[PDB]
Structure 1
């Protein structure tokens, strides 16, 4: 069960990620509010998911969904680039991230 609230900890990671983009340097109320609230949901949801699970596999999947969700919802909502190159260096960055967090 703690796995799923780890998934959701990870979805809310993307939520504040997109809400923060929408806030325009944290100046638009509501996207600003979502950013804050959707953060301590992620962190809280984590600390509970982590209670049960390994800290390593917890964070690895938490930030994985965080980082990929941001990349995906970005190219979608903010019509951010979709270069052959960008999708590649993003893959090396997320695996390095996932990697180092899965070692600790």
Structure 2
């Protein structure tokens, strides 16, 4: 079960990410509020999942879900670009992060 709360901890990482985009620089109340609570929930569940799971594997799946999830919801909600090059470099970037945090 320690894995499932790590997935949820990564889901809320996408939550406060999209909300931070709706807050327009922490200006709009409620998006700026979903953002603050979204990262406290993420940080809490992470510290709970990391209490059982490997700190290296836990972070790689934590920011991996959040990073990829931020790319997906962005190109959908905010109609963010979907270029062949951008997705390739995002893959290189996301695997580079998921890689460094896993090998720790």
Q: Secondary structure at the match of 2:27?
A: coil
- 1:100 matched to which residue of 2? 100
- 1:47 matched to which residue of 2? 47
After the TM superposition, which parts of structure 1 deviate over 3 Å for at least 4 consecutive aligned residues? none
Q: Secondary structure at the match of 2:82?
A: coil
Aligned positions, number: 104
CA deviation digits over 1:22-60, x for unaligned, max 9?
Answer: 000110000000000011000000000000000001000
Aligned Cα RMSD in Å? 0.3
Tell me how far 1:64 sits from its aligned partner: 0.2
Cα separation, 2, equivalents of 1:79 and 1:19: 15
Cα separation, 2, equivalents of 1:93 and 1:8: 22
TM-score where L is the length of structure 2: 0.99
Cα separation, 2, equivalents of 1:94 and 1:79: 20
TM-score where L is the length of structure 1: 0.99
Cα separation, 2, equivalents of 1:65 and 1:9: 9
Tell me how far 1:99 sits from its aligned partner: 0.2
Cα separation, 1, equivalents of 2:88 and 2:72: 13
Cα separation, 1, equivalents of 2:65 and 2:53: 16
Q: Which runs of 5+ in 1 are unaligned?
A: none
Cα separation, 2, equivalents of 1:70 and 1:58: 18
